[PDB]
């Protein structure tokens, strides 16, 4: 009965997410936790300049996923 | 964390209050709460001008409370 359950299906996806501090991090998703703790692999983080980190990991404003994902098929239980 | 702290040794004692906004007031701590709200008698704020009032202080905005006399 939550949108957090479909977000665990968002694993392996690339997401350029914004934060409450307001940084930019483009990277592939590893896993999604029930409290929104997300793990990123092969990431491109930006604040300052853009700086690459490999294993990037409540402040997330929204993850802007790619348009290649069909949303209604994942939006079912 | 329903266990309230132990201000019972300072109850009915003089206080030097620390609060939000750089606020301080002197008064005798009459009662305590689970959330750290206090009850002060002989309310007198710390401006330099000290106006007597004669006070139920809110808990969260307060930072700490000191002792005038040891």
């Amino acid at each position: 009965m939550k949108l957090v359950n479909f977000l665990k299906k968002l694993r392996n996806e690339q997401v350029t997410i914004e934060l409450k501090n307001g940084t930019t991090v483009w990277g592939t998703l590893q896993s999604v936790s029930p409290q929104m703790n997300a793990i990123l692999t092969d990431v491109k983080l930006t604040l300052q300049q853009p700086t690459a980190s490999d294993n990037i990991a409540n402040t997330i404003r929204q993850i802007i996923l790619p348009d290649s994902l069909n949303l209604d098929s994942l939006l079912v239980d | 964390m329903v266990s309230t702290p132990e201000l019972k040794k300072y109850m009915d004692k003089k206080i030097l209050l620390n609060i939000n906004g750089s606020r301080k007031v002197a008064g005798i701590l009459r009662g305590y709460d689970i959330f750290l709200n206090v009850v002060l008698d002989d309310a007198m704020e710390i401006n330099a001008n000290n106006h007597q009032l004669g006070t139920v202080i809110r808990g969260n905005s307060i930072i700490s409370l000191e002792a005038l006399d040891a």
Partner: protein
Amino acid sequence: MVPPINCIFNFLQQQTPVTIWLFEQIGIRIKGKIVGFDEFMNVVIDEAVEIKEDVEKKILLKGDNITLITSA
């Protein structure tokens, strides 16, 4: 013991005027008598007025922004 819930019940039956402070805005003030309340620090202030001594004229307050409740 004088608990912060046991004191607030005397303010409603006594009908005393009480001044309300701000969460992070000390420049504003509050006033009025509280008829009833709730468990979360909800307040229904009667004769509601906003506190340089420009007193501006029931109100309902959120407990998260309450700072102090002092009788008198």
